Amino acid sequence: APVTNGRIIFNSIPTGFPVPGETTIYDTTETIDLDTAPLDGGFLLKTLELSVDPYMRGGMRAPEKKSYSAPFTLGQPLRGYGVGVVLRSENPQVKAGDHLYGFFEHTHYSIRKDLTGLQAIENAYNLPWSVFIGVIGMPGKTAYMAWKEYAHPKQGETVFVSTGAGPVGSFVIQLAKADGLKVIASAGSEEKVQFMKEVGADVAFNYKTTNTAEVLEKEGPIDIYWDNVGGETLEAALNAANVNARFIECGMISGYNSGGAPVRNIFHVIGKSITMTGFIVSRIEPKYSAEFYKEVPAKVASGELKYREHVYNGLEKLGDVILAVQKGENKAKAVVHVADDL
Amino acid sequence: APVTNGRIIFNSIPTGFPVPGETTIYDTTETIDLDTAPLDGGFLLKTLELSVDPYMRGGMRAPEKKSYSAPFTLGQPLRGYGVGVVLRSENPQVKAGDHLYGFFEHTHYSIRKDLTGLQAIENAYNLPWSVFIGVIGMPGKTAYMAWKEYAHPKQGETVFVSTGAGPVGSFVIQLAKADGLKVIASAGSEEKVQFMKEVGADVAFNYKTTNTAEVLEKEGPIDIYWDNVGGETLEAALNAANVNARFIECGMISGYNSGGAPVRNIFHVIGKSITMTGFIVSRIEPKYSAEFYKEVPAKVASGELKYREHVYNGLEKLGDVILAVQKGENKAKAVVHVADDL
Numbered sequence: 001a002p003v004t005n006g007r008i009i010f011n012s013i014p015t016g017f018p019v020p021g022e023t024t025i026y027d028t029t030e031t032i033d034l035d036t037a038p039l040d041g042g043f044l045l046k047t048l049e050l051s052v053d054p055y056m057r058g059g060m061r062a063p064e065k066k067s068y069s070a071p072f073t074l075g076q077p078l079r080g081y082g083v084g085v086v087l088r089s090e091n092p093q094v095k096a097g098d099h100l101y102g103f104f105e106h107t108h109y110s111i112r113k114d115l116t117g118l119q120a121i122e123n124a125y126n127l128p129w130s131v132f133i134g135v136i137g138m139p140g141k142t143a144y145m146a147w148k149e150y151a152h153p154k155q156g157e158t159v160f161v162s163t164g165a166g167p168v169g170s171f172v173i174q175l176a177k178a179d180g181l182k183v184i185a186s187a188g189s190e191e192k193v194q195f196m197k198e199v200g201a202d203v204a205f206n207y208k209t210t211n212t213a214e215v216l217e218k219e220g221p222i223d224i225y226w227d228n229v230g231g232e233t234l235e236a237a238l239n240a241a242n243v244n245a246r247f248i249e250c251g252m253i254s255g256y257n258s259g260g261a262p263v264r265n266i267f268h269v270i271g272k273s274i275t276m277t278g279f280i281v282s283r284i285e286p287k288y289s290a291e292f293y294k295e296v297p298a299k300v301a302s303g304e305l306k307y308r309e310h311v312y313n314g315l316e317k318l319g320d321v322i323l324a325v326q327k328g329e330n331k332a333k334a335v336v337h338v339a340d341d342l
Numbered sequence: 343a344p345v346t347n348g349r350i351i352f353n354s355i356p357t358g359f360p361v362p363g364e365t366t367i368y369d370t371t372e373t374i375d376l377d378t379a380p381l382d383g384g385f386l387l388k389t390l391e392l393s394v395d396p397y398m399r400g401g402m403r404a405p406e407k408k409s410y411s412a413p414f415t416l417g418q419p420l421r422g423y424g425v426g427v428v429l430r431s432e433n434p435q436v437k438a439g440d441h442l443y444g445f446f447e448h449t450h451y452s453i454r455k456d457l458t459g460l461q462a463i464e465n466a467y468n469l470p471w472s473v474f475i476g477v478i479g480m481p482g483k484t485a486y487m488a489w490k491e492y493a494h495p496k497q498g499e500t501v502f503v504s505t506g507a508g509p510v511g512s513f514v515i516q517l518a519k520a521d522g523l524k525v526i527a528s529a530g531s532e533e534k535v536q537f538m539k540e541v542g543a544d545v546a547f548n549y550k551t552t553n554t555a556e557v558l559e560k561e562g563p564i565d566i567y568w569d570n571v572g573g574e575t576l577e578a579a580l581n582a583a584n585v586n587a588r589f590i591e592c593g594m595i596s597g598y599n600s601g602g603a604p605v606r607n608i609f610h611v612i613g614k615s616i617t618m619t620g621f622i623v624s625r626i627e628p629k630y631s632a633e634f635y636k637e638v639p640a641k642v643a644s645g646e647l648k649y650r651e652h653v654y655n656g657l658e659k660l661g662d663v664i665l666a667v668q669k670g671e672n673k674a675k676a677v678v679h680v681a682d683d684l
Binding site: 057067230234243249250251252254259260262263264265266267268269270271272273274275276277278279280283 | 399409572576585591592593594596601602604605606607608609610611612613614615616617618619620621622625
C-alpha cells in the first residue's frame, strides 16, 4: 500500500538564522507505492543518510556543482549530499541493493531517470553509510586531495591547521602526522581541543583562551598553513611563516555577501617566498577519486583514520539540524539518519 | 704617480628624500698609486659601471645579499651592483683584463682579497658593460628566472604585467610574447606606454588616464598576473582572474616601514583556484644562472630582447642620480658610467 514520502520543503527566505517550521516545513502530503510506482526506465531510490553542511557565502544554496551552487525553489524540497539504496530498477546502470552517493532531495524516496549526480559506493568493509558524507565524502576529499596536491611535505616540517577539529581539519591533522610533521592546530572549544589531541596534534589550543600569535612564535616557524578561516588567523600564519612555506587556502569566514576579511601583511608572500594555493575540491577530484575511495575506507576500518559525526534521527528533524549547524551547535559533522537499510 | 680615488660617501641619514651634498658627498681625499699599491695576494679592481636601484622597504640599505640588506656606515662609501675590470692581480683566481660583476663600493678603485661578492662575466658578443647591471643583471634575472619557474604558460593565455615598462616588467612582456601569450601591461607615463608597445604588449595603457578594472574586464580574464605593485592593482587582477590563474609576486609598493597595502578580496584565491607565489631572486638564481648568462646575451646582441637604460656620466653625479631614482625621474634603469675600459 502507499507510504508517506516525507519532504523537507523550502517555505520562506530567512533574513537571519533559519527558523524551523517557517524557513523549512516537514510535509507529508505526498505518498508513493513502492511496488507499483511507475519508473519509466529509471529506478526507485530510498534515502538513507543526509548531510547538513553549513552555508554562508552566497546565501542559502545547494552545495556547489559545476562550480554553481543553485538556490532553492519555494515549495520544493531542499537538497544536499546523501546516500541511498536502490529498491527497484528498470535501468541497466543500477540494480536493487546498490548504494549510491551524490546529490539528494530531502525526501524519503525519489525516482531517478539515470545516474546523473550519483555514483556507486564501494563499501568493502561494510562501514556505516554515513561515513560517505563525511570522512569518506566531500569533507574528507577536500582534506585528502588538496593535501596530496599542494603540501609537498618533508619529514619534521611544522604545519598549522586552523579549525583543526572539523571534518576537514581533523583529517588534515592525521595526514600531516602520517607524513612525519609536527602539527599545531586550533579550535574554539574544549571538546574540539580534546579531539585534535586525540588525532595526534602536537600543540592543540583554543584560540579563545590562548594567543595564536604567541603559540606560533613559540612553536613555529610554520612550513605549511592549512587555512579554513582567512582573516586574522591567516595574517598570524603569514607573520610566523618559514621561508618556502605553503599556504593551502581551503575556506575563509564571510557573511552572505562580504567575501572575506582583509589581509594586511600580504608582503610576507614575497619576503618569505610563500606559495599560496587556493582550490575547489570538485576541480581536483578527478585526479584522486579512485585512490581516495580505495585507500580511505581501509584506514577508517582499521581505526587509523579517526572521525566524528553528530547523528540526528529522522527526516522530520532536518530543519532543526540546519539551524543547529548554522549556530555551530552540532558537536561534529552533522548527519540526518533518514532510514535503516533493510 | 698617484691618482685620485673618488668616493661617494654616506654623510647623513635623510628623513625624506636624499639631499645631494648632504646625504651623500663626493670625496676626493684619497689617492692610490695604480702601479705600486700593495695588493698582498689580492687584486686591483677598476670600477666601470654602477647601478642606482631604488630603495624603499627597509630604508636606505645595500641591495639584498644572504637575504640581508645591510645599512650604510657614515663616513664610508655607498655600495650597490656594479661592473669592473681587473688592472693588476696577485691572486690566481683573476688576471688583468678580467671583467667582474657583483657588489661594488662607490669608488673609482678598490683592492680585493679574493672573489667574494664577485663573479667573472662572459661577454662573448662584446655588449656594453652596463647591460650586466640591467637586462643581464639583477633586474633581468628577476624577470627571467621567476617566469621560467612559475608562469607555466600555455599558448594564447593572457598575462597582465604591472609596471610593464620597467627593467623587470619590460623583460616579462618579452618573455610572455615569446611564449605566445596575449600581454596587457600598464605604466604611469606616455613614454613608458610607448616602450611597452615597442616590446610587444598587445594592450598597453597608462593607469593614470585609463581605468585598470575596465581594461581587465574588456581584455581578460587574466591567466597570469606579474605583480610589481601590490595593493589596488593586485586587487583588480584578482577580480579579473581566470580559474587556475598564476599570480607571480615580485614586488609591492610600500614606505620605509609600512610593508604593503591591504588585499581586501583575497577570497578569489580560493574561488578561482589561484596559485600565488612570492619569490626572492637570489633564492632561485642557482637553478638558472648558467642558462641565463648563456642565452640572454645572445638575445640582446641579436636585438630580440630590447632594453632601455638611463646613463649618467661620472661618479661625482651618483648622489644626484640616487635622488632622481627616488623621485622616479630617470627614464629607464639608472646607470652611472664611472670609467671607460682602456
